[PDB]
Amino acid sequence: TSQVRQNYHQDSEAAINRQINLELYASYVYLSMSYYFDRDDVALKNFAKYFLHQSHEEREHAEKLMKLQNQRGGRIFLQDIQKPDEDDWESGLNAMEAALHLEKNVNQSLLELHKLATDKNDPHLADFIETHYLNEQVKAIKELGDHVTNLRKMGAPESGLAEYLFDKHTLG
Amino acid sequence: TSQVRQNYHQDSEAAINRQINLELYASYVYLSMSYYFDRDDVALKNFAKYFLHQSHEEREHAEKLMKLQNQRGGRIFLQDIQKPDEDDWESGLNAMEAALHLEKNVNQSLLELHKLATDKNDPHLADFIETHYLNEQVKAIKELGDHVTNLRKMGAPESGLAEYLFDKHTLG
Amino acid sequence: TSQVRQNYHQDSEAAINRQINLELYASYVYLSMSYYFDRDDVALKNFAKYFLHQSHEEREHAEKLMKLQNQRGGRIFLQDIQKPDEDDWESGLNAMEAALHLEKNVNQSLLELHKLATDKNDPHLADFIETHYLNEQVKAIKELGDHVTNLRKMGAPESGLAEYLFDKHTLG
Amino acid sequence: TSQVRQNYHQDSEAAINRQINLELYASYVYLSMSYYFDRDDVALKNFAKYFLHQSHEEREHAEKLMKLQNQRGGRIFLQDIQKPDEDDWESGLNAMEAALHLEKNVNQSLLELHKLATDKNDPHLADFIETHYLNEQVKAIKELGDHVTNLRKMGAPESGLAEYLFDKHTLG
Amino acid sequence: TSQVRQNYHQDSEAAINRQINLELYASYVYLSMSYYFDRDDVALKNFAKYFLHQSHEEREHAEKLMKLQNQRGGRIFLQDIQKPDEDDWESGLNAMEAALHLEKNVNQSLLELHKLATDKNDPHLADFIETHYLNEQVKAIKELGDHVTNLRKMGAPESGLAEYLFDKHTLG
Amino acid sequence: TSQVRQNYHQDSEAAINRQINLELYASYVYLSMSYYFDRDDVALKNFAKYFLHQSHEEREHAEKLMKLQNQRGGRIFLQDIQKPDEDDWESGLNAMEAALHLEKNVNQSLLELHKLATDKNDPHLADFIETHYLNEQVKAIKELGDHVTNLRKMGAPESGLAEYLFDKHTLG
Ligand SMILES: [Ca+2]
Ligand SMILES: [Ca+2]
Ligand SMILES: [Ca+2]
Ligand SMILES: [Ca+2]
Ligand SMILES: [Ca+2]
Ligand SMILES: [Ca+2]
Ligand SMILES: [Ca+2]
Ligand SMILES: [Ca+2]
Ligand SMILES: [Ca+2]
Ligand SMILES: [Ca+2]
Ligand SMILES: [Ca+2]
Ligand SMILES: [Ca+2]
Ligand SMILES: [Ca+2]
Ligand SMILES: [Ca+2]
Ligand SMILES: [Ca+2]
Ligand SMILES: [Ca+2]
Ligand SMILES: [Ca+2]
Ligand SMILES: [Ca+2]
Ligand SMILES: [Ca+2]
Ligand SMILES: [Ca+2]
Ligand SMILES: [Ca+2]
Ligand SMILES: [Ca+2]
Ligand SMILES: [Ca+2]
Ligand SMILES: [Ca+2]
Ligand SMILES: [Ca+2]
Ligand SMILES: [Ca+2]
Ligand SMILES: [Ca+2]
Ligand SMILES: [Ca+2]
Ligand SMILES: [Ca+2]
Ligand SMILES: [Ca+2]
Ligand SMILES: [Ca+2]
Ligand SMILES: [Ca+2]
Ligand SMILES: [Ca+2]
Ligand SMILES: [Ca+2]
Ligand SMILES: [Ca+2]
Ligand SMILES: [Ca+2]
Ligand SMILES: [Ca+2]
Ligand SMILES: [Ca+2]
Ligand SMILES: [Ca+2]
Ligand SMILES: [Ca+2]
Ligand SMILES: [Ca+2]
Ligand SMILES: [Ca+2]
Ligand SMILES: [Ca+2]
Ligand SMILES: [Ca+2]
Ligand SMILES: [Ca+2]
Ligand SMILES: [Ca+2]
Ligand SMILES: [Ca+2]
Ligand SMILES: [Ca+2]
Ligand SMILES: [Ca+2]
Ligand SMILES: [Ca+2]
Ligand SMILES: [Fe+3]
Ligand SMILES: [Fe+3]
Ligand SMILES: [Fe+3]
Ligand SMILES: [Fe+3]
Ligand SMILES: [Fe+3]
Ligand SMILES: [Fe+3]
Ligand SMILES: [Fe+3]
Ligand SMILES: [Fe+3]
Ligand SMILES: [Fe+3]
Ligand SMILES: [Fe+3]
Ligand SMILES: [Fe+3]
Ligand SMILES: [Fe+3]
């Protein structure tokens, strides 16, 4: 056992490894979305920038969980990063809806992790998840919902003018 | 159901609406206290400023709960803001004692809200309440207790000289 | 009688208490409107900011009337702040129309207050109302009318694109 | 009962007094270690500085718990600060190992305190401990483990050259 | 066919998709190496920082190839990012040797890509690879070889003092 | 015998260890006094700050004696730090009187130490004590006497107004 390990359950260690993979997966989904908007036949530069920023932030989220694993004396076991479920994200609205779904899935996983930490009487882990992950997820979900609403109200996806103007005025 | 809503119980949503009202009520109590000290026959300008500041801070507290409700996909339902239980707050000491009582009541409500969040396995809400409300309440209660103690020790309310000097040296 | 009171009729004192309540009510209506636009299914951030600013300004208006009451040696008697007449404000256009109606009601009350002051030969009160309230109300009403006109001309509320663009270009 | 006391169990108050003593004890252990490295026959100035810094930080930790006790309306009861379990700390490596053991003991106590707070439905106390103590302890333990590992890998304690170079390059 | 596509062979498009995956794979290998050095039982902070920097640079390399694919009117098809071939990288020297091997494999792939571009008379692609990838690879390989040589000459891995000092003086 | 030791009697070494303990004890007494004034039912913030400053200065005094012991080639032997003789310090005046008594006791010990140094023909130790301790003690005693006098003349402890005003105007 690691000399630093204290009050850190095997199940929590495993759940953190799973969460690392999920954050890396989210980073990869956002990378895919970004470059879809960089296609010459899509050509929404601020959608591309928005999703690239999200991709880089998800990598930061994963790295912080890797740091946590080592802080607690767990051992990192990486797994493959699955490719995303689409190659073509169809539209700005559709990508935002897929991102909303992704973020809710990530949130669900984090909530299960918090419950595990609580069940194993690991208050350090529970508060790590609260403090660094749970409000970030609520903010991310709220932002994506706001974006979806605006795009729908403006007439996306059928209105390419709507997506163009949203790209300029919200994402610019 | 709101597209953002996740792990947010109906009971929690209702409790947040009640808490919004209570913070707005506290803002109104402090507004009343402030202008009592602005009366020509009371004339304690720093008591007036202290309570006006508290009034504005309570409004900020309410607004942050309104933001939370929307972040979580709940729906804000406002209720009347009841007028305070006094029109004439009698003295600096008496107002400070009433403020202490108010803050303990607000704290009790927040503790019940945290317990509800915990019971509904809503760690985001529990940590929102911890992080933004519970230590602020402990600090507020401690400050008011300190003020009450000083005013009592100095001879308030019968000593108008005591209230005058406290106004200058503590609240100035 | 207060040592400062001079030329200040009982009826004027009562009317000022009523006006304090009306300004606090207007503040609360605007607070409600603000957070309606913060909902994830409405999501017009600059409408939200506009109405929050109006809410805070109405509180300032109320506080100045409280100060006036004490300046003149009247006594403040607060009343409940009624909740607004809607929970759901429907659209940007509908909220602007409701705000226009509110401001005209507040203006009507202020005009009646000025008439009372004049009838009681209270030129200080009449000029307080002129100087600090009446042109502010005319400006507020004109602005809201301008906003209503633009939203109607642009195609609101059926055009969510109209409300989106107004939010960006007028209220941003 | 103190006028500020609310939701603060007798057992929690007692546990906070015990924790104050433990933090003061840790401060004293680190003070002892510091001046061991200041001996002419040990002469590792950066080990001395490192442990003196830790001593001063532990005093800050104790003072913050004293402040907490008063914030909550508990009453501070101090106890003797026991002298450390060694006078001669043998080597840089041995002192780091003893510090690691100390910090794990302090952590164990803090975890028991959090569990108590949770059991007594004291979310303010639980989050005080989370926010100000638990991650600090995880960081402290990780740092000490890292230091122990490096010293072992370098050849300490038999290599006085190892301890010398660690003093310069890690602790300098 | 994309409106921008000109002189861009199907085989080149496919090879660029493969290269994107390989750069993302290299990023993941370096991420794994980084956090191995962050373990409490390894504890070489500058090895950790070095490899994290390499990880982030490999992501940049992948993103630039994604941009290229779109510039030329090809279509990005992402694939899974395979987990690395080790979980435990054993030592600073062993990780540097594995990184050298990785970089030579990436170089081999880039050289094959250049040959393909040349064979398909695609001078834009050939010079993209020359200009942005081939000298970077030669520099990376030379640096890693230099690091391997130094660690071997110093006595790594058996000398943990060697790895410690290399971490401080070369990688710091 | 330590390689640095010269003209340093065993009895002097022992007396320095005793003095270290006494300075640490004084630090602890002042810490206790400080947080007594931080109680909600005492609430004299500048008394609290004054005594906390004294606590930190006494720790500095102890650390300098530890440094001296090592400078001379003596060996530090720490002892328990006894808890203070009161938990409740009663009033500002009573705490100042207890501090005066403490400082006179510390002075008596330092004078005995100087006499010992003189008797053992240790002029370095005698002048260390003169230069760094004896005038500091005379200044401390004079200040505390001045404070006691003022509090008595003002009407402390029965006048809580006296203690309040002293806290503001002398200790602020
Ligand atoms: Ca464990
Ligand atoms: Ca386990
Ligand atoms: Ca595992
Ligand atoms: Ca796959
Ligand atoms: Ca698929
Ligand atoms: Ca599919
Ligand atoms: Ca499909
Ligand atoms: Ca927030
Ligand atoms: Ca739900
Ligand atoms: Ca429900
Ligand atoms: Ca409700
Ligand atoms: Ca009422
Ligand atoms: Ca009543
Ligand atoms: Ca009544
Ligand atoms: Ca009554
Ligand atoms: Ca928390
Ligand atoms: Ca605090
Ligand atoms: Ca009159
Ligand atoms: Ca009249
Ligand atoms: Ca009236
Ligand atoms: Ca009503
Ligand atoms: Ca109604
Ligand atoms: Ca209705
Ligand atoms: Ca209706
Ligand atoms: Ca004008
Ligand atoms: Ca209690
Ligand atoms: Ca109890
Ligand atoms: Ca106790
Ligand atoms: Ca002992
Ligand atoms: Ca012993
Ligand atoms: Ca022993
Ligand atoms: Ca022994
Ligand atoms: Ca950290
Ligand atoms: Ca072509
Ligand atoms: Ca082709
Ligand atoms: Ca292909
Ligand atoms: Ca694989
Ligand atoms: Ca394998
Ligand atoms: Ca293998
Ligand atoms: Ca193998
Ligand atoms: Ca070329
Ligand atoms: Ca070169
Ligand atoms: Ca000697
Ligand atoms: Ca001797
Ligand atoms: Ca001795
Ligand atoms: Ca004792
Ligand atoms: Ca005793
Ligand atoms: Ca006693
Ligand atoms: Ca006694
Ligand atoms: Ca002097
Ligand atoms: Fe995100
Ligand atoms: Fe994430
Ligand atoms: Fe407050
Ligand atoms: Fe509040
Ligand atoms: Fe207005
Ligand atoms: Fe108004
Ligand atoms: Fe520490
Ligand atoms: Fe500590
Ligand atoms: Fe590289
Ligand atoms: Fe590369
Ligand atoms: Fe002193
Ligand atoms: Fe001293």
XYZ file of N, CA and C in Angstrom, chain B residues 142 145-146 149-150 153-154 165-166 169-170, chain F residues 38 40-44 160-161 164 168-169:
66
model
N -22.161 35.803 14.712
C -21.078 36.149 15.626
C -20.897 37.653 15.722
N -23.767 39.102 17.733
C -23.573 38.820 19.141
C -22.519 39.716 19.773
N -21.405 39.903 19.066
C -20.367 40.802 19.541
C -20.927 42.215 19.757
N -23.197 42.341 22.825
C -22.388 42.315 24.036
C -21.794 43.674 24.335
N -21.176 44.296 23.346
C -20.583 45.598 23.585
C -21.604 46.625 24.028
N -22.582 45.939 27.623
C -21.496 46.276 28.544
C -21.316 47.772 28.690
N -21.539 48.517 27.623
C -21.365 49.971 27.634
C -22.494 50.686 28.360
N -21.434 56.467 21.164
C -20.028 56.112 21.027
C -19.848 54.825 20.237
N -20.751 53.855 20.393
C -20.693 52.635 19.602
C -20.884 52.936 18.133
N -17.477 54.495 17.013
C -16.225 53.752 17.078
C -16.308 52.343 16.539
N -17.424 51.663 16.623
C -17.580 50.339 16.038
C -18.180 50.415 14.649
N -11.878 37.261 22.108
C -12.610 36.928 20.897
C -13.948 36.246 21.172
N -17.812 35.773 22.025
C -18.954 36.649 21.711
C -19.472 37.410 22.907
N -19.236 36.905 24.117
C -19.682 37.501 25.367
C -18.597 38.322 26.036
N -17.509 38.602 25.323
C -16.416 39.456 25.798
C -16.197 40.536 24.737
N -15.796 40.123 23.536
C -15.943 40.896 22.302
C -15.134 42.202 22.323
N -13.863 42.093 22.681
C -12.924 43.227 22.652
C -11.801 42.874 21.679
N -17.810 48.582 31.717
C -17.580 48.027 30.411
C -17.357 49.079 29.350
N -17.928 50.274 29.551
C -17.614 51.416 28.705
C -16.099 51.749 28.753
N -14.240 49.136 26.736
C -14.550 49.387 25.337
C -13.700 50.523 24.786
N -10.541 50.683 22.007
C -10.518 51.510 20.797
C -9.325 52.430 20.758
N -9.066 53.148 21.837
C -8.150 54.278 21.767
C -6.722 53.947 22.136
